[PDB]
Write an enzyme that holds these catalytic residues in place. Structure first.
Site, mmCIF file in Angstrom:
data_model
loop_
_atom_site.group_PDB
_atom_site.id
_atom_site.type_symbol
_atom_site.label_atom_id
_atom_site.label_comp_id
_atom_site.label_asym_id
_atom_site.label_seq_id
_atom_site.Cartn_x
_atom_site.Cartn_y
_atom_site.Cartn_z
ATOM 1 C CB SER A 94 -0.957 0.014 1.190
ATOM 2 O OG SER A 94 -1.601 -1.238 1.349
ATOM 3 C CE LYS B 251 -4.489 1.879 0.399
ATOM 4 N NZ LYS B 251 -4.008 0.481 0.213
ATOM 5 C CE1 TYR C 288 -4.126 2.700 4.354
ATOM 6 C CE2 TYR C 288 -4.337 0.345 4.751
ATOM 7 C CZ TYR C 288 -3.739 1.402 4.099
ATOM 8 O OH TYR C 288 -2.743 1.158 3.181
ATOM 9 C CD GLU D 29 -1.137 6.718 7.145
ATOM 10 O OE1 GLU D 29 -1.142 6.778 8.392
ATOM 11 O OE2 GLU D 29 -1.608 5.742 6.525
ATOM 12 C CE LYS E 81 -0.305 4.029 3.064
ATOM 13 N NZ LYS E 81 -1.030 3.123 3.996
ATOM 14 C CB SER F 270 2.632 -5.332 4.060
ATOM 15 O OG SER F 270 2.790 -4.296 5.018
HETATM 16 B B1 LIG Z 1 -1.058 -2.323 2.154
HETATM 17 O O1 LIG Z 1 -1.161 -1.762 3.485
HETATM 18 O O2 LIG Z 1 0.149 -3.120 2.069
HETATM 19 C C1 LIG Z 1 -2.347 -3.238 1.853
HETATM 20 C C2 LIG Z 1 -3.577 -2.898 2.429
HETATM 21 C C3 LIG Z 1 -4.699 -3.683 2.168
HETATM 22 C C4 LIG Z 1 -4.567 -4.816 1.365
HETATM 23 C C5 LIG Z 1 -3.358 -5.177 0.756
HETATM 24 N N1 LIG Z 1 -3.381 -6.284 -0.023
HETATM 25 C C6 LIG Z 1 -4.411 -7.099 -0.350
HETATM 26 O O3 LIG Z 1 -5.580 -7.055 0.024
HETATM 27 C C7 LIG Z 1 -3.953 -8.226 -1.258
HETATM 28 I I1 LIG Z 1 -2.078 -9.025 -0.664
HETATM 29 C C8 LIG Z 1 -2.236 -4.354 1.019
#
Ligand SMILES: *[B]([O])([O])C1=[C][C]=[C]C([N]C(=O)[C]I)=[C]1
Length: 359
Positions: free
Chosen positions: A62, A65, A148, A270, A313, A316
């Site tokens: 993310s 993002k 989130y 953030e 940020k 993962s």
């Molecule tokens: B991010 O914070 O790394 C993140 C948030 C929400 C969901 C994902 N991935 C998936 O739903 C598929 I691995 C990453």
């Protein structure tokens, strides 16, 4: 320069970490004095005895993002989109009465009313996609609660490119990556580049990111440590951005639209005011906090970028772990890419160490 002691901070902090958490390969980027110092460790692929390398591609999660928020910000910059148009304007199909008072800012900032974290695995196409949103029921009212969610900021980015006329992968490349010369950042790694793609490591086993709706907008982007260092530099000292819209886009994304007690919400980014206690930052990155429905206090109008912040940020995927931070007032920031997923508070602890040592 303290380059000798600085390259000692690196070692002395990530080595006990890699083994303490069973980390296979790590790549670190520090920006001290506007000059990126790369350090590589472990293996990209142990199965093939490949080590890590600046050209080595990690999954961003993310942290993608952040690209969304600037993609979307540079777009506000051109006056294509505005932070307050009703969502309904760029996608009039959403006819649910519930959608009425939801704005683009809401979607941009997890403010709409409890939009889910994950898009349902059940969701596989545009029609099932519009179904889901059209059926969806908020628990809270807009502009009151921050939760989130992928389902919130993904659709924002999806619609945020609409008046452009070019699909996400297109705009994202044409309007952001190329101008900033991020020539090795990928939504879709080329076959010719795949050699640089590493493996993430989960329950002993080796995995990688898999397709799903609004992924690109939520956890698509894949890149190497070098580009991550340039990405960071453009965000920390944006004045140096040649293009006008982008520069402002970077502005807008780091502006502050809501306050969640100790932190402040921006586009993707953030931010906590600098200086800030480590325990504050670290604590707030535990998942018993980060994924929590929390009330929100708005800044109207949205304060413009403050120099003295901790902007950051976490990010993962199934087998990857990434984290970026940088105090813009103090010309520095770090980058930690890992081919594994390990506890967020652990990533941000180590950073702080190495970071406050640059002071
Ligand atoms: B991010 O914070 O790394 C993140 C948030 C929400 C969901 C994902 N991935 C998936 O739903 C598929 I691995 C990453």
């Amino acid at each position: 320069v303290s380059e000798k002691q600085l390259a000692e901070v690196v070692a002395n902090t990530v080595t006990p970490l890699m083994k303490a958490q069973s980390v296979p390969g790590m790549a670190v980027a520090v920006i001290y004095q506007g000059k990126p110092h790369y350090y590589t460790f472990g293996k990209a692929d142990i199965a093939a005895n490949k080590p890590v390398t600046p050209q080595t591609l990690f999954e961003l999660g993310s942290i993608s993002k952040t690209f969304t928020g600037v993609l979307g910000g540079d777009a506000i910059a051109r006056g294509e989109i505005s932070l307050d148009d009703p969502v309904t304007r760029y996608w009039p199909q959403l006819t649910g009465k519930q959608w009425q008072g939801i704005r683009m800012l809401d979607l941009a900032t997890y403010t709409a009313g409890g939009l889910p974290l994950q898009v349902p695995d059940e969701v596989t196409d545009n029609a099932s996609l519009v179904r889901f949103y059209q059926n969806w029921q908020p628990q809270w009212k807009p502009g009151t609660t921050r939760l989130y969610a992928n389902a919130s900021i993904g659709l924002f980015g999806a619609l945020a490119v609409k008046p452009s006329g070019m699909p996400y992968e297109q705009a994202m490349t044409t309007r952001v990556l190329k101008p900033l010369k991020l020539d090795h950042t990928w939504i879709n790694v080329p076959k010719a580049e795949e050699a640089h793609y590493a493996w993430g490591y989960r329950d002993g086993k080796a995995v990688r990111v898999s397709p799903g709706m609004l992924d690109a907008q939520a956890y698509g982007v894949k890149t190497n440590v070098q580009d991550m260092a340039n990405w960071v530099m453009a965000n920390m000292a944006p004045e140096n951005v040649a293009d006008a819209s982008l520069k402002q886009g970077i502005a807008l994304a780091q502006s502050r639209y809501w306050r969640i007690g100790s932190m402040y919400q921006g586009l993707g980014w953030e931010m906590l005011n600098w200086p800030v206690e480590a325990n504050t930052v670290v604590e707030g990155s535990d998942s018993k906090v980060a994924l929590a429905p929390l009330p929100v206090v708005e800044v109207n109008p949205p304060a413009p970028p403050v120099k003295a912040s901790w902007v950051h940020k976490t990010g993962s995927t199934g087998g990857f772990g990434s984290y970026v931070a940088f105090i813009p007032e103090k010309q520095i920031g770090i980058v930690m890419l890992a081919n594994t997923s390990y506890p967020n508070p652990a990533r941000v602890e180590a950073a702080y160490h190495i970071l406050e040592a640059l002071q």
